[PDB]
Amino acid sequence: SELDQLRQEAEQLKNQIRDARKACADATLSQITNNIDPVGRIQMRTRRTLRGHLAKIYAMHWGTDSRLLVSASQDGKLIIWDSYTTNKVHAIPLRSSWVMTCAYAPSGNYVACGGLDNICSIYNLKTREGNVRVSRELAGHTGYLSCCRFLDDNQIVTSSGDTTCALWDIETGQQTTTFTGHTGDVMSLSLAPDTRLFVSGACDASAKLWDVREGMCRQTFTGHESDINAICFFPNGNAFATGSDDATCRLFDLRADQELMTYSHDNIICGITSVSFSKSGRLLLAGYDDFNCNVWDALKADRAGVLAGHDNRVSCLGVTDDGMAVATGSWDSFLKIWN
Amino acid sequence: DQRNEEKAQREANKKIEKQLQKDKQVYRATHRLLLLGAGESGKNTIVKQMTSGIFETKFQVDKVNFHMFDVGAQRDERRKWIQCFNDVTAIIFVVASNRLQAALKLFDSIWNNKWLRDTSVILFLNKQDLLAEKVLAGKSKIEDYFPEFARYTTPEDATPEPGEDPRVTRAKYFIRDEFLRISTASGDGRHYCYPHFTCSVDTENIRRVFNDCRDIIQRMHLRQYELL
Amino acid sequence: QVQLQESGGGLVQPGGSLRLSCAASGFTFSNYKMNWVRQAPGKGLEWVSDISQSGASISYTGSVKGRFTISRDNAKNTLYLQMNSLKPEDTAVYYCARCPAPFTRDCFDVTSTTYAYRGQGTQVTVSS
Amino acid sequence: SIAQARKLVEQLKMEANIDRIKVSKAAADLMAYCEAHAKEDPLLTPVPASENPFR
Amino acid sequence: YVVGRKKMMDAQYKCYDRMQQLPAYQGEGPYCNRTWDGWLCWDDTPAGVLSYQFCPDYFPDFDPSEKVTKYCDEKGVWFKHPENNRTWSNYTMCNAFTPEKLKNAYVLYYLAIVGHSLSIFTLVISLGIFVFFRSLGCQRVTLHKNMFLTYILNSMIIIIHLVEVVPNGELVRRDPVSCKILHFFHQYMMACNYFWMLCEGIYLHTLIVVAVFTEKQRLRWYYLLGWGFPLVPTTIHAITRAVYFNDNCWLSVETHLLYIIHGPVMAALVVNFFFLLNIVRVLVTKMRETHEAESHMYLKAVKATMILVPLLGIQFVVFPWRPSNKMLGKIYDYVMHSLIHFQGFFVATIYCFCNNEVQTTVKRQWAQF
Amino acid sequence: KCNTATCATQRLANFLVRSSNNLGPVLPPTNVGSNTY
């Protein structure tokens, strides 16, 4: 039948890509990094503690000013903190009570939230009466929302559990382009610092590089053995790292199109929930379900001080744009800022 | 000049914590419930007893708040959004009493989940009358789906409603003990199940939920004091 | 690359035993709980069997608990499902599924209509 | 289930014909970024106190 | 010695009025006539009748519980002690067991100074753990933080009262007012401790039997009953102990005015006993609903009862009898003083050290070093 | 007199201050023989 020949030529394409990539691999990145000098131990304690949430924390996002951060909890509340004064700023109630994601505008004028309601809500913070109200609600996703990332003041990229990623358009309420390439629930995504390309990881153990300009799958990155729950870019923009539930963290290069290093350890067994990089890229962070976060190095596996300050499962974390300090989130409704 | 921003954020903080404690008083006094069922399980009747990806129904029973959440419009993938329900009071399970083995496999997965441990399960065996008539005529009996049904016997603690078929008591207790075999296996003393016998006309299912929720909170309070 | 391919199957006479395979690659075969599902024509997916990591926890569907027999080989990274005396009720394509989260006693979404960690269907037609 | 197979092969055909650089150059470009901005990495080296609002 | 000498005259005139009365006989017959002994008064008794009356406290070696017996000759006559040929009565029993009773009191003294010593060092860690750790914050631990504070204050006051007041002799002979205050603080802290057990009793009862769904119980009544309420019986007993009966340092235990505080305390502990029976009844019927093993059900019922006795103070209502037997009396003092003095240690071990949440919290915060 | 278990510590201190010489040696018990009543 036609399904047989289409499947057969599909496998032949997988082979010729793999053979071309295998011929492309000349020297593992571990070999070229054999002459580098390890940084050592950068063990550091927490600086600030943030309290005020009722239920577990699922997501957070940092601000461009590297001072404002917003988190979401199952109680139906959005809280924008102050990393310096520790004093809360805004308290946004939610119509639903099962939010599973959060975001932050590049200019600080917008936030995002989504969950089991299958509707992404955009809240405008710079209103005219000094209060907070929802600006636009986006409906059309069949499944729950899992990750949102603002590209600019007009368009937003949201990933839902309907196996499709969408590029919405505020002030219109309709989708512009849809990325129907995944065969599993999409968990997290991140955008490169050029508002042109972004990668998205789903529950099909594959991270796909999309293009918002044409709405097609530019490249596909594989290597993980379980569902991908975290993803982040290298500061240069030509590389990105992922994180799955198999206690493995891998580094991918947009030009190599294959895994380079696996930042895994035999002691860690729980899955990763959130990853991030440093300003210079000479570091690596990855959350875990064993109540603490590990610190690595991009050039080679160099275990630094473990950021162990949480009681429940770590579900979200981030790094400031200036790279001065980092933040972490956990299900104990507690947020800490490590520097 | 810089202190005014501080007192502004402090005043903004207190007015935020005031509303947080205001909503905490109703959040701690609300017993959220997860209404879960299978395809054509008859769970709509429970909703009517008193698009969007989830439904809500706020009903009070003797100054007690119960919040049921119905999963509507979500795909069959449950391994990701079932983790959000690790803080509810109980997960109401609806079965269409092979459409029965899948309910047992879904109950087993929820029971043995790593986050959904510590949450109890309220089981409702709906379609009790429809199942009773079909086993009475004998056109489609459940031995094809359960070969051990012949070797099963009526429990000593059976309470058959008078006039119920000698066969319906065998059927309702067999399905009841099927879920008990799963709950008692992984049960370490943190969450229990309360199977019930729900018909298509009985309106006392709301009273059953109140009694099970009372047992859940009582066992939780006993566990905090290490008494039980 | 996570991929599962199954073998065996075909037209079998009633009362004839048949065996199936499930070759797994791209991951650790020993650190996952593998399961089976069936898709009867004009019906939905139905769970058939499963097996734990080592092989201690093994369950089968009540509909055919006795005749079916499952086994796995962690060293060779291949799993085998043995079926004896096939009945007309078993004329369904069998898909090799794979539980996503490792080191878990539970397993969600085994019989979902659309699943990533699940191979193709091996047709097993039971007819005269 | 015939349209989805065509979409999978078409996306795979367009993805196959792309330019991929050698791993040696990709690693060299990777280390070049770290060596140039290592001085402006606050997480890499502990900055002196009283220089950040995280006191 | 000289204080009893003043009491000798007062007690003498007391009976000389009662001696004037004629209770001689219901029926006319031979009977020993009323007399006056230097130590105590004697009424009329039948011939050859060994009548006994309460023994006085002329000298410190005399015991109040014991009694003295008038002795007349068995053949219906008066008795003269064979050695001295003068009237004698059974006054030796009053001071017979004084040396033996003085050694056991020293054992009870050091058992109290050690019991309260191993009731503060063990509790400062328990109080410090609950305060420094914010992850253990709830209404149960909130009452435990105040329950432990009462044990610490009660233990410290008893230690100060047993080392600076009891071993001092010239202090009590001068009757200092400061000594009365240390006694008022002792009675207040004792009554406050014996009402926080009721507060823990009523709080635990409103979580298993009634008002289970009620969250955020008002702590105003628990704080008032724990601290505010016990102030009333102690201040009523204090003002009444200055008009009807007063002595040095208010260290008397023979006046019936002590029941102003200890009376309502016993009634508060009876309510805790009824609550314990209701709680264990609900606990039993809970295991009955699951068809649990009979042997394991009794084990959980006994274990839950044994861990609630120190919290609710059930040992006071279960053991209110002071056995008059000499051997049983010594055992009762050893058992009860051990349950009273070594009580803050038992509550700390069960509810802070044996707690599963506290152990996991300490292990987690210590392993991250 | 009180015999309740609550007033048990008070009955220990009272016996020590009265019978014992402020936690010290005591004069031998007063003569209770026939010579003294």
Please report where in the chains the tokens 């509507």 appear, as a residue: B72
Give me the number of domains chain E comprises: 2
**Neighbouring residues of E341: CB distance < 8 A, sequence distance ≥ 6:** E111, E112, E114, E115, E116, E119, F9
Nearest-5° Cα angle at E263, E261 to E264 = 80
Strand partners, E77: E73
Which residue, among A225, A223, A219, A301, has the nearest Cα to A254 in the 3D structure? Answer: A219
| Inter-chain CB proximity A14 and D12 less than 8 Å | yes
Distance CA E103, CA E98 (A): 9
Distance CA A232, CA A95 (A): 30
Residues in A touching D9 (Cβ below 8 Å): 6, 9-10, 13
Q: Say if B218 is an interface residue toward chain E (CB within 8 Å).
A: yes
> Shortest CB distance from D22 goes to which of A24, A218, A281?
A24
Count residue pairs from B and E with Cβ separation < 8 A. 49
| SS3 state at A50 | strand
The residue range of the domain holding E45 is 20-95
Tokens standing for B11? 């005043």
Distance CA B115, CA A245 (A): 15
Find the helix packing angle between D3-16 and A2-24, rounded to 10°. 20
| Inter-chain CB proximity D23 and A26 less than 8 Å | yes
| SS3 state at A163 | coil
The residue range of the domain holding C23 is 3-126
DSSP alpha helices (H): ranges in chain A? Answer: 2-24, 29-32
For B53, D41, E95, the CA distances from B91, given in Å and listed in that order, are 18, 49, 74
Distance CA B10, CA A88 (A): 8
Which residue is closest to A162 within chain C, CA to CA?
A: C114
The one-letter amino acid at C26: G
Distance CA E218, CA E221 (A): 7
First to last CA, chain E: 67
Tokens standing for E119? 């009731």
Q: Say if B29 is an interface residue toward chain A (CB within 8 Å).
A: no
Distance CA A281, CA D30 (A): 9
Strand partners, B33: B68, B90
Please say whether the beta carbons of A235 and D29 come within 8 A.
no
The one-letter amino acid at B90: A
**CATH code: domain of residue E82:** 4.10.1240.10
**CATH code: domain of residue C68:** 2.60.40.10
Chain centroid to Cα A82, Å, comes to 22
| Inter-chain CB proximity C101 and B76 less than 8 Å | no
Distance CA E239, CA C87 (A): 95
Residues in B touching C90 (Cβ below 8 Å): none
| SS3 state at E46 | strand
CB count within 10 Å of CB D28 equals: 11
Chain centroid to Cα A107, Å, comes to 19
The DSSP element (H or E) to which E215 belongs, if any, is none
Q: For residue D23, count CB atoms less than 10 angstroms from its CB and return exposed for 0-12, middle for 13-18, buried for 19 or more.
A: buried
Residues in A touching C2 (Cβ below 8 Å): 205, 225
Please say whether the beta carbons of B219 and E292 come within 8 A.
no
Please say whether the beta carbons of A205 and C2 come within 8 A.
yes
Which residue, among A65, A139, A57, has the nearest Cα to A101 in the 3D structure? Answer: A57
Which residue, among A176, A168, A179, A174, has the nearest Cα to A201 in the 3D structure? Answer: A179
Q: For residue A274, count CB atoms less than 10 angstroms from its CB and return exposed for 0-12, middle for 13-18, buried for 19 or more.
A: buried
Please say whether the beta carbons of A257 and D20 come within 8 A.
yes
Please say whether the beta carbons of E79 and E72 come within 8 A.
yes
Rg (CA), chain C: 14
Give me the number of domains chain C comprises: 1
**Neighbouring residues of B185: CB distance < 8 A, sequence distance ≥ 6:** none
Give the neighbor-by-neighbor strand order of the sheet with A275-276. A275-276, A284-286, A294-296
Which residue is closest to C108 within chain B, CA to CA?
A: B79
Distance CA E221, CA A152 (A): 56
PDB experimental method: cryo-EM
Q: Measured between CA atoms, how close is D50 to chain A, in angstroms?
A: 13
Chain centroid to Cα C61, Å, comes to 11
Residues E109 and E59 in one domain: no
Distance CA A251, CA A262 (A): 7
Which residue, among F13, F11, F16, has the nearest Cα to F26 in the 3D structure? Answer: F16
Tokens standing for E168? 């001092």
Sequence positions preceding breaks in chain E, C–N over 2.5 Å: none
| Inter-chain CB proximity A271 and C101 less than 8 Å | yes
| Inter-chain CB proximity E322 and F13 less than 8 Å | no
Please say whether the beta carbons of B101 and C63 come within 8 A.
yes
Which residue, among B213, B203, B195, B217, has the nearest Cα to B93 in the 3D structure? Answer: B195
| Inter-chain CB proximity B81 and A144 less than 8 Å | yes
E7 within some domain: no
User: E with F: 3 or more CB pairs under 8 Å?
Assistant: yes
Of E62, E95, E128, the one marking the end of a domain is E95
For A207, B85, C80, C109, E77, the CA distances from B80, given in Å and listed in that order, are 18, 10, 29, 10, 104
The DSSP element (H or E) to which A218 belongs, if any, is strand A216-222
Q: For residue E351, count CB atoms less than 10 angstroms from its CB and return exposed for 0-12, middle for 13-18, buried for 19 or more.
A: buried
Strand partners, A201: A188, A207
| Inter-chain CB proximity D33 and A280 less than 8 Å | yes
| Inter-chain CB proximity B20 and A89 less than 8 Å | no
| Inter-chain CB proximity F34 and E265 less than 8 Å | no
Domains of chain B in start order, with CATH, are 33-223 (3.40.50.300)
| Inter-chain CB proximity F30 and E95 less than 8 Å | yes
| Inter-chain CB proximity A309 and E135 less than 8 Å | no
Which residue is closest to A228 within chain C, CA to CA?
A: C100
**Neighbouring residues of C43: CB distance < 8 A, sequence distance ≥ 6:** C92
Please say whether the beta carbons of E304 and B227 come within 8 A.
yes
Distance CA B182, CA B110 (A): 11
| SS3 state at A140 | coil
CB count within 10 Å of CB E222 equals: 21
Residues E124 and E232 in one domain: yes
Chain centroid to Cα E50, Å, comes to 34
**CATH code: domain of residue A128:** 2.130.10.10
Tokens standing for B169? 């008591």
The one-letter amino acid at F6: T
Q: For residue A113, count CB atoms less than 10 angstroms from its CB and return exposed for 0-12, middle for 13-18, buried for 19 or more.
A: buried
Nearest-5° Cα angle at E137, E131 to E140 = 105
E339 within some domain: yes
DSSP alpha helices (H): ranges in E314-355? Answer: 315-318, 326-341, 344-348
Residues E251 and E354 in one domain: yes
Q: Say if B31 is an interface residue toward chain E (CB within 8 Å).
A: yes
Reported as half-sphere exposure (CB side, CA atoms, 13 A), residue E151 has a value of 31
Distance CA E138, CA E207 (A): 14
In chain B, at which residue ranges do the beta strands (DSSP E only) sit? 30-37, 54-60, 65-71, 90-96, 120-126, 193-196
Residues E87 and E107 in one domain: no
The DSSP element (H or E) to which A338 belongs, if any, is strand A334-338
Count residue pairs from E and F with Cβ separation < 8 A. 118
DSSP E249: G
Which residue, among C31, C34, C2, has the nearest Cα to C103 in the 3D structure? Answer: C31
Distance CA E352, CA E119 (A): 13
Residues E103 and E70 in one domain: no
Count residue pairs from A and B with Cβ separation < 8 A. 83
Residues E358 and E275 in one domain: yes
The residue range of the domain holding A254 is 2-338
Strand partners, A145: A160
Residues in D touching A32 (Cβ below 8 Å): 24, 27-28, 31
Distance CA A163, CA B198 (A): 37
E184 within some domain: yes
Tokens standing for B134? 């079909």
Sign of CA dihedral E297, E298, E302, E308: positive
Reported as half-sphere exposure (CB side, CA atoms, 13 A), residue A123 has a value of 23
Q: For residue B2, count CB atoms less than 10 angstroms from its CB and return exposed for 0-12, middle for 13-18, buried for 19 or more.
A: exposed
For A295, B85, D21, the CA distances from D34, given in Å and listed in that order, are 17, 43, 20
CB count within 10 Å of CB B177 equals: 13
Q: Measured between CA atoms, how close is E320 to chain F, in angstroms?
A: 5
The one-letter amino acid at A235: P
First to last CA, chain B: 59
**Neighbouring residues of B109: CB distance < 8 A, sequence distance ≥ 6:** B78, C106, C107, C108
Please say whether the beta carbons of A311 and A291 come within 8 A.
yes
The one-letter amino acid at C2: V
Of E95, E113, E146, the one marking the end of a domain is E95
Q: For residue A60, count CB atoms less than 10 angstroms from its CB and return exposed for 0-12, middle for 13-18, buried for 19 or more.
A: buried
Of E95, E122, E139, the one marking the end of a domain is E95
Q: Measured between CA atoms, how close is A61 to chain B, in angstroms?
A: 20
> Shortest CB distance from E108 goes to which of F12, F24, F35?
F12
List, as one string, the DSSP characters of chain C.
--EEEEEE-EEE-TT--EEEEEEEESS-GGGS-EEEEEE-TTS-EEEEEEE-SSS--EEE-STTTTT-EEEEETTTTEEEEEE-S--GGG-SEEEEEE-SSSS-S----SS-SS-SSEEEEE-EEE--
Q: Measured between CA atoms, how close is A32 to chain C, in angstroms?
A: 26
Nearest-5° Cα angle at E314, E313 to E320 = 110
CB count within 10 Å of CB E3 equals: 12
Q: Measured between CA atoms, how close is E266 to chain B, in angstroms?
A: 25
Tokens standing for E154? 């009660």
Distance CA E181, CA E278 (A): 40
| Inter-chain CB proximity A253 and D30 less than 8 Å | yes
Distance CA E170, CA E166 (A): 10
Please say whether the beta carbons of E45 and E70 come within 8 A.
yes
| Inter-chain CB proximity E88 and F19 less than 8 Å | no
Q: Say if B207 is an interface residue toward chain E (CB within 8 Å).
A: no
Question: Which site among B40, B41, B109, B141 would you substitute to test the C interface, given the most C Cβ atoms closer than 10 Å to its Cβ?
Answer: B109
Would you list which residues of chain C are within 8 Å, Cβ to Cβ, of chain A? 1-2, 26-28, 100-103, 114-117
Give me the number of domains chain A comprises: 1
In E5-153, at which residue ranges do the beta strands (DSSP E only) sit? 31-32, 35-36, 41-42, 45-46, 52-54, 67-69, 72-73, 77-78
